[PDB]
Write a protein that binds this DNA or RNA. Structure first.
Lengths: 137, 137
DNA sequence: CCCGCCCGGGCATGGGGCCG
DNA sequence: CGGCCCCATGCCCGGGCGGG
Protein backbone atom coordinates (compact mmCIF):
# COMPACT_ATOMS: atom_id res chain seq x y z
CA UNK A 1 0.00 0.00 0.00
CA UNK A 2 0.87 3.69 0.34
CA UNK A 3 2.32 4.76 3.70
CA UNK A 4 1.18 8.23 4.75
CA UNK A 5 2.05 7.87 8.42
CA UNK A 6 4.74 6.35 10.57
CA UNK A 7 4.63 2.68 11.44
CA UNK A 8 5.55 1.01 14.73
CA UNK A 9 8.70 -1.10 14.74
CA UNK A 10 7.72 -4.74 14.37
CA UNK A 11 8.53 -6.93 17.43
CA UNK A 12 11.01 -9.79 17.26
CA UNK A 13 10.46 -13.52 17.55
CA UNK A 14 13.82 -14.68 16.20
CA UNK A 15 17.06 -12.66 16.41
CA UNK A 16 17.00 -12.80 12.59
CA UNK A 17 14.06 -10.42 12.76
CA UNK A 18 16.49 -7.81 14.03
CA UNK A 19 18.42 -6.11 11.22
CA UNK A 20 22.00 -7.36 11.19
CA UNK A 21 23.79 -4.00 11.74
CA UNK A 22 21.74 -3.48 14.93
CA UNK A 23 22.26 -6.99 16.27
CA UNK A 24 25.31 -6.35 18.43
CA UNK A 25 23.68 -3.38 20.20
CA UNK A 26 20.51 -5.46 20.65
CA UNK A 27 22.46 -8.39 22.09
CA UNK A 28 24.37 -6.07 24.40
CA UNK A 29 21.14 -4.64 25.79
CA UNK A 30 19.71 -8.09 26.33
CA UNK A 31 22.69 -9.15 28.37
CA UNK A 32 22.69 -5.79 30.11
CA UNK A 33 19.00 -5.80 31.07
CA UNK A 34 18.75 -9.47 31.98
CA UNK A 35 15.55 -10.32 33.81
CA UNK A 36 14.60 -6.64 33.82
CA UNK A 37 14.02 -6.90 30.07
CA UNK A 38 11.25 -9.46 30.35
CA UNK A 39 7.61 -8.38 30.49
CA UNK A 40 6.18 -8.23 34.01
CA UNK A 41 2.37 -8.63 33.91
CA UNK A 42 1.75 -6.77 37.18
CA UNK A 43 3.46 -3.58 35.96
CA UNK A 44 1.79 -1.04 33.71
CA UNK A 45 3.55 1.20 31.24
CA UNK A 46 4.17 4.46 33.05
CA UNK A 47 7.75 5.29 32.13
CA UNK A 48 10.09 5.99 29.30
CA UNK A 49 13.54 7.16 28.46
CA UNK A 50 13.71 9.79 25.76
CA UNK A 51 16.97 9.75 23.80
CA UNK A 52 17.79 12.65 21.53
CA UNK A 53 20.47 13.96 19.22
CA UNK A 54 21.27 15.32 15.78
CA UNK A 55 21.92 11.97 14.08
CA UNK A 56 18.80 10.07 12.97
CA UNK A 57 20.78 7.02 11.81
CA UNK A 58 22.21 6.16 15.21
CA UNK A 59 18.84 6.78 16.76
CA UNK A 60 17.28 4.30 14.34
CA UNK A 61 19.82 1.67 15.32
CA UNK A 62 18.98 2.39 19.02
CA UNK A 63 15.26 2.04 18.27
CA UNK A 64 15.89 -1.27 16.53
CA UNK A 65 18.08 -2.39 19.43
CA UNK A 66 15.71 -1.85 22.35
CA UNK A 67 13.00 -4.39 21.69
CA UNK A 68 12.03 -6.63 24.60
CA UNK A 69 9.10 -7.73 26.74
CA UNK A 70 9.44 -4.93 29.27
CA UNK A 71 11.40 -2.41 27.20
CA UNK A 72 10.02 -1.22 23.83
CA UNK A 73 11.33 1.60 21.64
CA UNK A 74 9.03 3.62 19.44
CA UNK A 75 10.19 4.86 16.04
CA UNK A 76 12.58 7.73 15.30
CA UNK A 77 10.71 11.00 15.75
CA UNK A 78 11.76 14.59 16.38
CA UNK A 79 11.22 17.51 18.74
CA UNK A 80 9.62 20.80 17.68
CA UNK A 81 12.28 23.22 16.50
CA UNK A 82 12.07 26.09 19.01
CA UNK A 83 12.74 29.07 16.83
CA UNK A 84 10.24 30.47 14.34
CA UNK A 85 13.48 29.77 12.49
CA UNK A 86 13.99 26.32 10.92
CA UNK A 87 17.00 25.04 12.81
CA UNK A 88 19.11 21.89 12.99
CA UNK A 89 16.55 19.15 13.58
CA UNK A 90 16.74 17.36 16.91
CA UNK A 91 15.66 13.74 16.50
CA UNK A 92 14.46 11.56 19.38
CA UNK A 93 13.36 8.08 20.42
CA UNK A 94 11.05 7.17 23.28
CA UNK A 95 11.97 3.86 24.89
CA UNK A 96 8.97 2.75 26.96
CA UNK A 97 9.43 0.93 30.28
CA UNK A 98 7.16 -0.77 32.79
CA UNK A 99 8.88 0.70 35.86
CA UNK A 100 11.28 3.42 37.04
CA UNK A 101 14.19 1.12 37.90
CA UNK A 102 14.20 -0.36 34.42
CA UNK A 103 14.12 3.08 32.80
CA UNK A 104 17.19 4.22 34.77
CA UNK A 105 18.83 0.93 33.82
CA UNK A 106 18.04 1.63 30.15
CA UNK A 107 19.70 5.03 30.34
CA UNK A 108 22.79 3.47 31.84
CA UNK A 109 22.82 0.65 29.27
CA UNK A 110 23.10 3.07 26.40
CA UNK A 111 25.86 4.93 28.28
CA UNK A 112 27.88 1.73 28.64
CA UNK A 113 27.35 0.94 24.98
CA UNK A 114 28.75 4.36 24.11
CA UNK A 115 31.68 3.75 26.44
CA UNK A 116 32.56 0.53 24.56
CA UNK A 117 31.93 2.04 21.11
CA UNK A 118 33.56 5.46 20.73
CA UNK A 119 32.40 5.76 17.13
CA UNK A 120 28.79 5.49 18.27
CA UNK A 121 27.44 8.94 18.95
CA UNK A 122 26.81 10.46 22.34
CA UNK A 123 23.08 10.78 22.93
CA UNK A 124 21.30 12.98 25.45
CA UNK A 125 18.60 11.31 27.55
CA UNK A 126 15.94 11.91 30.17
CA UNK A 127 13.61 9.84 32.32
CA UNK A 128 9.95 10.25 31.45
CA UNK A 129 6.91 9.73 33.74
CA UNK A 130 3.30 9.41 32.63
CA UNK A 131 0.35 10.23 34.89
CA UNK A 132 -1.68 7.54 33.19
CA UNK A 133 -0.53 4.17 31.85
CA UNK A 134 -0.03 3.73 28.12
CA UNK A 135 -1.98 1.13 26.09
CA UNK A 136 1.04 -1.11 25.54
CA UNK A 137 -0.55 -4.02 27.48
CA UNK B 1 18.06 17.07 4.77
CA UNK B 2 16.97 13.57 5.87
CA UNK B 3 13.81 13.02 3.76
CA UNK B 4 13.19 9.56 5.21
CA UNK B 5 13.03 10.87 8.76
CA UNK B 6 10.27 12.96 10.34
CA UNK B 7 10.24 16.72 10.26
CA UNK B 8 9.12 19.07 13.02
CA UNK B 9 5.88 20.86 12.14
CA UNK B 10 6.44 24.42 10.94
CA UNK B 11 5.56 27.47 13.13
CA UNK B 12 3.05 30.15 12.09
CA UNK B 13 3.68 33.89 12.02
CA UNK B 14 0.00 34.62 11.47
CA UNK B 15 -3.16 32.56 11.55
CA UNK B 16 -3.48 32.32 7.76
CA UNK B 17 -0.34 30.15 7.87
CA UNK B 18 -2.11 27.50 9.88
CA UNK B 19 -3.30 24.72 7.54
CA UNK B 20 -7.03 25.04 6.90
CA UNK B 21 -8.21 21.83 8.56
CA UNK B 22 -6.36 22.54 11.80
CA UNK B 23 -7.36 26.20 11.91
CA UNK B 24 -10.61 25.87 13.90
CA UNK B 25 -8.89 23.97 16.72
CA UNK B 26 -6.00 26.40 16.47
CA UNK B 27 -8.25 29.45 16.99
CA UNK B 28 -10.06 27.83 19.87
CA UNK B 29 -6.85 26.68 21.61
CA UNK B 30 -5.36 30.15 21.25
CA UNK B 31 -8.28 31.71 23.05
CA UNK B 32 -8.42 28.95 25.71
CA UNK B 33 -4.72 28.95 26.52
CA UNK B 34 -4.73 32.73 26.73
CA UNK B 35 -1.66 34.20 28.43
CA UNK B 36 -0.35 30.64 29.03
CA UNK B 37 0.23 30.20 25.31
CA UNK B 38 2.88 32.90 25.24
CA UNK B 39 6.49 31.86 25.86
CA UNK B 40 7.77 32.53 29.35
CA UNK B 41 11.57 32.68 28.96
CA UNK B 42 12.10 31.70 32.61
CA UNK B 43 10.28 28.37 32.26
CA UNK B 44 11.97 25.24 30.99
CA UNK B 45 10.42 22.54 28.88
CA UNK B 46 9.74 19.82 31.38
CA UNK B 47 6.21 18.80 30.52
CA UNK B 48 4.12 17.36 27.79
CA UNK B 49 0.71 15.99 27.10
CA UNK B 50 0.62 12.83 25.03
CA UNK B 51 -2.54 12.33 22.96
CA UNK B 52 -3.19 8.98 21.38
CA UNK B 53 -5.75 7.28 19.17
CA UNK B 54 -6.31 5.30 15.98
CA UNK B 55 -6.95 8.18 13.58
CA UNK B 56 -3.68 9.59 12.34
CA UNK B 57 -5.55 12.35 10.45
CA UNK B 58 -7.28 13.61 13.58
CA UNK B 59 -3.96 13.59 15.37
CA UNK B 60 -2.38 15.50 12.50
CA UNK B 61 -4.99 18.21 12.88
CA UNK B 62 -4.27 18.39 16.63
CA UNK B 63 -0.51 18.49 16.03
CA UNK B 64 -0.87 21.37 13.59
CA UNK B 65 -3.29 23.19 15.89
CA UNK B 66 -1.06 23.28 18.95
CA UNK B 67 1.73 25.59 17.88
CA UNK B 68 2.38 28.54 20.21
CA UNK B 69 5.10 30.23 22.25
CA UNK B 70 4.71 27.95 25.25
CA UNK B 71 2.93 25.02 23.62
CA UNK B 72 4.54 23.08 20.76
CA UNK B 73 3.34 19.81 19.29
CA UNK B 74 5.69 17.27 17.77
CA UNK B 75 4.79 15.32 14.63
CA UNK B 76 2.36 12.44 14.39
CA UNK B 77 4.14 9.34 15.63
CA UNK B 78 3.05 6.03 17.10
CA UNK B 79 3.48 3.72 20.08
CA UNK B 80 4.94 0.26 19.78
CA UNK B 81 2.22 -2.34 19.37
CA UNK B 82 2.78 -4.99 22.05
CA UNK B 83 1.87 -8.17 20.23
CA UNK B 84 3.66 -9.69 17.23
CA UNK B 85 0.27 -9.60 15.48
CA UNK B 86 -1.97 -7.41 13.35
CA UNK B 87 -3.53 -4.95 15.75
CA UNK B 88 -4.59 -1.40 14.99
CA UNK B 89 -1.68 0.99 15.10
CA UNK B 90 -1.99 3.44 17.96
CA UNK B 91 -0.80 6.87 16.84
CA UNK B 92 0.30 9.61 19.23
CA UNK B 93 1.29 13.25 19.47
CA UNK B 94 3.48 14.80 22.17
CA UNK B 95 2.49 18.38 22.96
CA UNK B 96 5.38 20.01 24.79
CA UNK B 97 4.74 22.58 27.53
CA UNK B 98 6.80 25.00 29.55
CA UNK B 99 5.11 24.19 32.85
CA UNK B 100 2.58 21.93 34.55
CA UNK B 101 -0.33 24.36 34.68
CA UNK B 102 -0.14 24.81 30.93
CA UNK B 103 -0.05 21.08 30.30
CA UNK B 104 -3.23 20.68 32.39
CA UNK B 105 -4.78 23.45 30.29
CA UNK B 106 -3.78 21.70 27.04
CA UNK B 107 -5.40 18.46 28.16
CA UNK B 108 -8.54 20.40 29.14
CA UNK B 109 -8.63 22.41 25.91
CA UNK B 110 -8.89 19.27 23.83
CA UNK B 111 -11.61 17.94 26.15
CA UNK B 112 -13.56 21.17 25.56
CA UNK B 113 -13.18 20.98 21.81
CA UNK B 114 -14.48 17.42 21.86
CA UNK B 115 -17.41 18.51 24.02
CA UNK B 116 -18.36 21.24 21.52
CA UNK B 117 -17.97 18.95 18.54
CA UNK B 118 -19.55 15.55 19.11
CA UNK B 119 -18.50 14.42 15.61
CA UNK B 120 -14.86 14.67 16.72
CA UNK B 121 -13.04 11.56 17.81
CA UNK B 122 -12.21 11.07 21.48
CA UNK B 123 -8.48 11.20 22.06
CA UNK B 124 -6.92 9.54 25.08
CA UNK B 125 -4.32 11.64 26.90
CA UNK B 126 -1.78 11.77 29.71
CA UNK B 127 0.37 14.37 31.42
CA UNK B 128 4.07 13.77 30.90
CA UNK B 129 7.00 14.72 33.14
CA UNK B 130 10.67 15.00 32.23
CA UNK B 131 13.54 14.61 34.73
CA UNK B 132 15.75 16.84 32.62
CA UNK B 133 14.64 19.82 30.51
CA UNK B 134 14.30 19.40 26.73
CA UNK B 135 16.35 21.47 24.22
CA UNK B 136 13.42 23.62 23.03
CA UNK B 137 15.30 26.76 24.20
C1' DC C 1 -18.99 24.37 10.31
C1' DC C 2 -16.23 20.57 11.14
C1' DC C 3 -16.10 15.52 11.23
C1' DG C 4 -13.55 10.94 9.76
C1' DC C 5 -11.66 8.80 6.08
C1' DC C 6 -9.80 8.65 1.35
C1' DC C 7 -6.28 9.53 -2.49
C1' DG C 8 -1.96 10.79 -5.67
C1' DG C 9 2.46 12.97 -6.12
C1' DG C 10 7.25 14.11 -5.05
C1' DC C 11 11.61 14.44 -2.73
C1' DA C 12 16.10 12.74 -1.64
C1' DT C 13 17.53 9.40 0.25
C1' DG C 14 20.33 5.63 3.37
C1' DG C 15 20.74 1.05 4.71
C1' DG C 16 20.94 -3.94 3.12
C1' DG C 17 24.09 -6.02 0.70
C1' DC C 18 27.69 -6.48 -2.58
C1' DC C 19 32.81 -6.14 -3.70
C1' DG C 20 37.18 -4.38 -3.25
C1' DC D 1 36.24 -8.11 6.67
C1' DG D 2 34.22 -3.01 6.40
C1' DG D 3 33.57 0.91 3.11
C1' DC D 4 30.53 2.18 -0.52
C1' DC D 5 26.44 2.39 -3.35
C1' DC D 6 21.80 3.08 -5.51
C1' DC D 7 16.65 2.35 -6.04
C1' DA D 8 12.99 0.70 -2.80
C1' DT D 9 11.86 3.54 0.73
C1' DG D 10 9.91 6.67 4.66
C1' DC D 11 8.19 10.89 4.97
C1' DC D 12 4.91 14.79 4.16
C1' DC D 13 1.73 17.77 1.35
C1' DG D 14 -2.83 18.97 0.31
C1' DG D 15 -7.17 18.16 -2.10
C1' DG D 16 -11.79 15.68 -1.94
C1' DC D 17 -16.24 13.25 -0.34
C1' DG D 18 -20.53 12.15 2.08
C1' DG D 19 -22.36 13.13 6.37
C1' DG D 20 -24.11 15.21 10.78
Amino acid sequence: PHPRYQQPPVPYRQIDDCPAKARPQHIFYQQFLGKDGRRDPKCQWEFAVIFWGNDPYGLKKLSQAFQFGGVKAGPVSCLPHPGPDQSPITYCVYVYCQNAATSKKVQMARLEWEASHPLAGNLQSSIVSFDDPLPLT
